[PDB]
Paper text:
[name], a subtype strongly associated with disease, functions as both a fast-transmitting Ca2+-permeable AMPAR at sensory synapses, and as a Ca2+-impermeable receptor at cortical synapses. Here we present cryo-electron microscopy structures of the Ca2+-permeable [name] homomer, which substantially diverges from other AMPARs. The [name] extracellular domain tiers (N-terminal domain (NTD) and ligand-binding domain ([name])) are closely coupled throughout gating states, creating interfaces that impact signalling and contain human disease-associated mutations. Central to this architecture is a stacking interaction between two arginine residues (Arg163) in the NTD dimer interface, trapping a unique NTD dimer conformation that enables close contacts with the [name].
[name] exists as two variants in vertebrates, [name](Gly439) and [name](Arg439) (hereafter, [name]-G and [name]-R). To assess this gating transition in [name]-G, we captured the receptor in an open state (in the presence of l-glutamate and the desensitization blocker cyclothiazide ) and monitored the conformational changes using standard 3D classification procedures. We further processed particles using a well-resolved NTD dimer (resulting from docking to the [name]), and these displayed clear features of activated AMPARs: closed [name] clamshells and a dilated gate that matches gate dimensions of other AMPAR subtypes. We also observed selective interaction of the extracellular [name] β1 loop with the B/D LBDs, while the other [name] pair targets the A/C KGK motif40 through their β4 loop. These contacts are conserved in apo and active [name].
Author numbering:
A (entry chain Y), H (entry chain Z): 6 to 39, 56 to 83, 94 to 161, 174 to 210
B (entry chain B): 485 to 509, 513 to 533
C (entry chain A): 534 to 553, 570 to 628
D (entry chain B): 583 to 630, 636 to 729
E (entry chain C), G (entry chain B): 789 to 828
F (entry chain D): 583 to 630
The structure:
């Protein structure tokens, strides 16, 4: 279980870092709205070309009202980051308490929920926008994939611990 | 303007504008992905 | 394509001595039945379980989805 | 199981727990909606270079020119717009000379260049030539 | 002519809601069984 | 089996003999053609 | 009206590529198992 | 075993001969191209009738450039011929080494791969065309079926040899 635990820890850290970078940076969308080739993020719009290179504005996000509010607050990407952090905390705490098996189950549940909320956040973002997609968007997607894989690994470790206990 | 300074023009009898003339000119092998947007395919995989 | 898919499914499901009483139910006759049932959208009595057999099944499923949907859509226009 | 369900096929196993059956049911509803939307006009989708002046300015593969003496060459000469200034800068030093003696000669040059030449002319003449045989030219942009 | 994600986002919301509901049901059953086992 | 094949619904049994599989295959082709022809414009006939 | 092979030639390419990939995977596993058996 | 192996050898030779003839001959397609009726193969067109009946002219082949290059090179029909030849060589060499069981498997894989490349070549030809098809087209189409049937036979022999070896 040492290799699986190492892989789970590395994947949890990688998913958390990727999602945090994706939320923090401003390379989500390569649109043209100021109109000279601006690259946008979840909160700012910066000009990649013209007389204003390096100036970052503030995105104005305002049924339709609910979608605008959810896109503005970015509750789902932030919630995914929070859930990934909690899953990493559970992974860390499972080492100190090697007898409480439900901690690794909690970690797996947190990782799966973080991936699901990342799906929801991507859906909300793409729906609210309606150009190309930058590397922050793909960082979020890769974070989703790694979160799902790490959740699978954590659930497998939980099953292995309970099977070994049953034997 | 340069012509108006030496000759008198009447009111226009036809409108125009400088335009671009070029010679005129089957989907790809992956045309089966066309009915849905690329975002839809990504979200379906996710 | 039906002939080739059935032959490759039988091959990847039965060639290796390290999986062999048959390891599965995927002789050439049953591979042909599986492919025909998949194409006709009539389900299958059996399904592949190996990685390579599941790759063959998945690509065949994608192929038959595209082809049957195209046939039905174009027939709706023909009618 | 998830793959065979979307592909509208089905596998040799099926969930038997309440939560597994909830997952299967919602995936089945998703598959129904998405596949019905996808395959509605699949056959239709299977059977189906320059957009403006900045496109001409930013490239080099296609040459462009105007008449030898006319309003368009003068318009490009005294224009203070950056894109038109660049276009005039290219035309002035273009070799062979891109300035044509007549509109018909420029149209013939466009037709015989195999898409390697663009002609800048008045919209009325472009609209006339576009709707005449051999119908091998078109107007791009506004 | 292609279909956009905005047109079919509701089915994605329904799918994720169903996944969350199934996870909640499974966890509730697990917790009840674990508490009953602990009492026994 | 034949009723389930026509409704494109499947059942819990399937032929295993060569002749039974020939019958199943021709019935499947018949069902595919007939159902594809039937369901093409069904709502148009319902509404009119 | 009748759509032709050129319209659907990509799916045939994907099918044959998948068949080749499956054969490659099966043969890689067979070679690995044969090496393991010979070493053992 | 002897009857099965005789069938395998005869089918391998028939498939090789059919594919070689289909590649080497010119009656692949009957088209009114050059505008007089003409029979065209893989490498040249010959006038079917008219004044210059019998004159043969090499094909003028020149996303789309790749398709025309593949069709002009005819890499897939020739690759099918080569794979059929290698499968026949394996079948012939299997008698020389009666204890090497993997030679039969090699022959089966070669025949299956030759059939698959035959499929690819047929698709490439028909796509690059965009009338009727001659007997060289249906020789290669027949060569595919035999190569797939001989590939099934060789795999059964490989299984039978190992089933015997296991007892």
């Amino acid at each position: 279980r040492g290799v699986q635990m190492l892989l789970t820890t590395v994947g949890a850290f990688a998913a958390f870092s990727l999602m945090t970078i994706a939320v923090g940076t401003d390379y989500w969308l390569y649109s043209r709205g100021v109109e000279v080739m601006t690259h946008s993020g979840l909160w700012r719009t910066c000009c990649l070309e013209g007389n204003f290179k390096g100036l970052c504005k503030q995105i104005d996000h305002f049924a339709e009202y609910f979608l605008r509010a959810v896109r503005a607050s970015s509750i789902f990407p932030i919630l995914s980051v929070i859930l990934l952090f909690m899953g990493g905390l559970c992974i860390a705490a499972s080492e100190f308490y090697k007898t409480r098996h439900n901690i690794i189950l909690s970690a797996g549940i947190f990782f799966v929920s973080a991936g699901l909320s990342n799906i929801i956040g991507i859906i909300v973002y793409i729906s609210a926008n309606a150009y190309s997609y930058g590397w922050s968007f793909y960082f979020g997607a890769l974070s989703f994939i790694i979160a799902e894989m790490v959740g699978v690994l954590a659930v497998h470790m939980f099953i292995d611990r309970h099977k070994q206990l049953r034997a | 303007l340069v012509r108006e300074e030496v000759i008198d023009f009447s009111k226009p009898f036809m409108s125009l504008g400088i335009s671009i003339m070029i010679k005129k000119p089957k989907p790809g092998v992956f045309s089966f992905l066309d009915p849905l947007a690329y975002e839809i395919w990504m979200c379906i995989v996710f | 394509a039906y002939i080739g898919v059935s032959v490759v499914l039988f091959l990847v499901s039965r060639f290796s001595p390290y999986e062999w009483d048959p390891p599965n139910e995927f002789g050439i006759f049953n591979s042909l039945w599986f492919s025909l049932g998949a194409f006709m959208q009539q389900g299958c009595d059996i399904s592949p379980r190996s990685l390579s057999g599941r790759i063959v099944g998945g690509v065949w499923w994608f192929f038959t989805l595209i082809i049957i949907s195209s046939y039905t859509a174009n027939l709706a226009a023909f009618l | 199981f998830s793959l065979g369900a979307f592909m509208q096929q089905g596998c040799d196993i099926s969930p038997r727990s309440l939560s597994g059956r909830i997952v299967g049911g919602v995936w089945w509803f998703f598959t129904l909606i998405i596949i019905s939307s996808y395959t509605a006009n699949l056959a239709a989708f299977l059977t189906v270079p320059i957009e403006s002046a900045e496109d001409l300015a930013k490239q080099t593969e296609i040459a462009y020119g105007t008449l030898d003496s006319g309003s368009t060459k003068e318009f490009f000469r005294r224009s203070k717009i950056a894109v038109y200034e660049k276009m005039w800068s290219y035309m002035k030093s273009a070799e062979p000379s891109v300035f044509t003696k007549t509109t018909a000669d420029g149209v013939a040059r466009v037709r015989k260049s195999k898409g390697k030449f663009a002609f800048l002319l008045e919209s009325t003449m472009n609209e006339y030539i576009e709707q005449r045989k051999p119908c091998d030219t078109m107007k791009v942009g506004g | 002519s292609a279909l956009s994600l905005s047109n079919v986002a509701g089915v994605f919301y329904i799918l994720v809601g169903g996944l969350g509901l199934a996870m909640m049901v499974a966890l509730i059953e697990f917790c009840y069984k674990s508490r009953a086992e602990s009492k026994r």
